[PDB]
């Protein structure tokens, strides 16, 4: 079933964005070969190479 009122409230409730969040910097665990990749590509980034445990 699909009526115009339902599709319009769907568009209204789909166009809503929850502000600025989930992408802002919190300090990217860009690991070492990715750092090698981006430095070969010659691009600047917030270097953060982490060494996980076993």
């Amino acid at each position: 079933i699909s009526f115009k009122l339902q599709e319009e409230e769907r568009e209204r409730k789909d166009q809503y964005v929850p502000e600025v969040s989930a992408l802002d910097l919190s300090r990217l665990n860009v690991d070492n070969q990715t750092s090698d990749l981006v430095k070969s590509l010659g691009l600047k980034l917030p270097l953060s190479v982490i060494n996980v445990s076993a």
């Binding site: 166009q15 964005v17 992408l23 990217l28 070969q33 990715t34 981006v38 691009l43 600047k44 980034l45």
Partner: protein
Amino acid sequence: SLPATFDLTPEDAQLLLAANTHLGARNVQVHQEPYVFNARPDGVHVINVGKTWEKLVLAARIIAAIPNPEDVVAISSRTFGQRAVLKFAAHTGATPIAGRFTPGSFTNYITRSFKEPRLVIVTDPRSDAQAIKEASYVNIPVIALTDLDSPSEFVDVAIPCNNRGKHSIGLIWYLLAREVLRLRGALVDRTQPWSIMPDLYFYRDP
């Protein structure tokens, strides 16, 4: 044959790596190894981020090469790709086929969902093989958002990404749409970031 401002810029790279779309599949087949980057221990392969962007630009050139935006068909059948394709429809011409593909849509000219596109872009070759297989009967170019373990049969153009990531799928559709509108008189200022955020390309639950 294209200017040097097209290269992967740090802000696009930052948002790309924030989506973690550089994460590939555990196993790769022979047709995705031109995009391998000498995998991590535990077997998680990683992708040529530059090649992802470069194929994205080439596919964007294909999309902004059909005169009519209203005869390009975007196929999705996964919950992550639904909202991305619908927003792709809101911003480009790019008519969607979300949810069921309704087999017999490129053939069978008496169906309600009968469309005749000049180009079809699929979110996942594996879960959208029905559209790909049917389009192979009627000469329709295929642009697939592939992963490392994805079929490449009848796949004309492939953009490697992470297909297990909701953020990755939404952002690739965002980037493709942004470059398509940039490759025409709607996003003339190519240096500035486009006015909105991929937050609503991302599939939102429930």
